[PDB]
Structure formats: C-alpha cells, structure tokens
UniProtKB/Swiss-Prot annotation:
Naturally occurring in which organism (per UniProt): Severe acute respiratory syndrome coronavirus 2 (2019-nCoV)
Protein name: Papain-like protease nsp3
Name of the gene: rep
Domain Macro positions: 1-167
Protein purpose: Responsible for the cleavages located at the N-terminus of the replicase polyprotein. Participates together with nsp4 in the assembly of virally-induced cytoplasmic double-membrane vesicles necessary for viral replication. Antagonizes innate immune induction of type I interferon by blocking the phosphorylation, dimerization and subsequent nuclear translocation of host IRF3. Also prevents host NF-kappa-B signaling. In addition, PL-PRO possesses a deubiquitinating/deISGylating activity and processes both 'Lys-48'- and 'Lys-63'-linked polyubiquitin chains from cellular substrates.
Residue numbers of the full-length protein present here: 1025 to 1191 of 7096
Subunit structure: May form homohexamers. Interacts with N protein.
Catalytic activity: Thiol-dependent hydrolysis of ester, thioester, amide, peptide and isopeptide bonds formed by the C-terminal Gly of ubiquitin (a 76-residue protein attached to proteins as an intracellular targeting signal)
Description of activity control: Inhibited in vitro by GRL-0617.
Localisation per UniProt entry: Host endoplasmic reticulum membrane
Effect on the protein of changing T31A: In strain: Mu/B.1.621
Mode of membrane association: Multi-pass membrane protein
Length: 167
C-alpha cells in the first residue's frame, strides 16, 4: 500500500492520473520523482522547468555541479540526484527529443531506467515539448517498465485521449 490517490489502473504495475506532477510530488513526497531531463540538465521548460521552479532553482544548482563533474548524460540515460522539497530523489531521465532529430527507438532505453526503482512518480517520456506522440510513449512505458509507475498527465484533454485509446 502506498499514498498515491485517484489513479486509474492501466496494468498490473502502471497507473495514470490527470495531474500536475509538481503538485502531485508536493502532496505525496514520493521516494522517486522522474524529471523529463535533457543531456545538459538544463531545466528550462516543460516538466523540467516546472520541477526546477518548484525547488527555487536548487535543482538547477545541483545539476550544474553534476555536469561540471561528470559531463552530459546520454540520450536514453539517467542520473539520480536530490528530490529537494518534492521527493526523496529525482531520477533525471533523458528521452529522445524529436524536435532535435533524436532516434525514437531510444525511448525504450529511457524507460528502462525506471526498472531500477520499485515505485516512481513520472511524466510520459518524450511527450510535451520533446515532440513524441504521447500515445506511443504510454505504449512503450507499459511494455518496458516492470516496477510500479504512477504517471501524471498535465493536460486533461490528452489524459482522456490516452485512457480512451489504451489497448
Ligand atoms: O512538455 C511536456 C507536456 C506534457 C507532459 N508534461 C507534464 N506532465 C505532468 N506534469 C506536468 N507539469 C507541467 C508543468 C509545466 F509548467 C509544464 C509541463 C508540465 C507537465 C510532458 O511529458 N512534457
């Protein structure tokens, strides 16, 4: 039993809700919140910009030190950093950005990072400003993640479409 509330159950392990991931994280304080990161951990917009703003830019400060030490992530890769005031940990995961020409096949590799964590609050990878089809992202999530994932979808219209079209 966990503290997530109001989710629709899609499969044995995947749950979905129309919610602002920032507000959901502040309420649940999950062990792991997933950020829709880029390889530079520059949290400018989309989910990343919103999560970073909610930390009063502390996420960005921590991230800049991480990059100065380690260099950029790989597309499809991840790193674990602090969750600040939102969660115990933040798993920064880099899905391919279609608006940069990156290979959508890397979306499965990106979701594989979730399997290192028993329970996660997460957005749909590569959705929103990353330019992929969110219906496809949900399919890859369900077919790749085996741990318990609670998906927050900000847009109510998109949420209804994701549910109604789910196979
Ligand atoms: O760009 C996108 C849009 C679709 C989906 N985004 C989100 N998912 C969940 N909660 C969210 N809260 C936000 C707060 C913001 F200010 C901006 C974006 C989001 C957002 C995604 O995957 N990427």
């Amino acid at each position: 039993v966990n503290s997530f509330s109001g989710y629709l159950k899609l499969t044995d392990n995947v749950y979905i809700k129309n919610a602002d991931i920032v507000e959901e994280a502040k309420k649940v304080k999950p062990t792991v919140v997933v950020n829709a990161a880029n390889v530079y951990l520059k949290h400018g917009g989309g989910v990343a910009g919103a999560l970073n703003k909610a930390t009063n830019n502390a996420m960005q400060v921590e991230s800049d030190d991480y990059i100065a030490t380690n260099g950029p992530l790989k597309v499809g890769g991840s790193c674990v950093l602090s969750g600040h005031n939102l969660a115990k940990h933040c798993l920064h995961v880099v899905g391919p950005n279609v608006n940069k020409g990156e290979d959508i096949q890397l979306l499965k590799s990106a979701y594989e990072n979730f399997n290192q964590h028993e329970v996660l609050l997460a957005p749909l990878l590569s959705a929103g400003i990353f330019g992929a089809d969110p219906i496809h992202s949900l399919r890859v999530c369900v077919d790749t993640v085996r741990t318990n994932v609670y998906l927050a979808v900000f847009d109510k219209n998109l949420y209804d479409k994701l549910v109604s079209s789910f196979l």
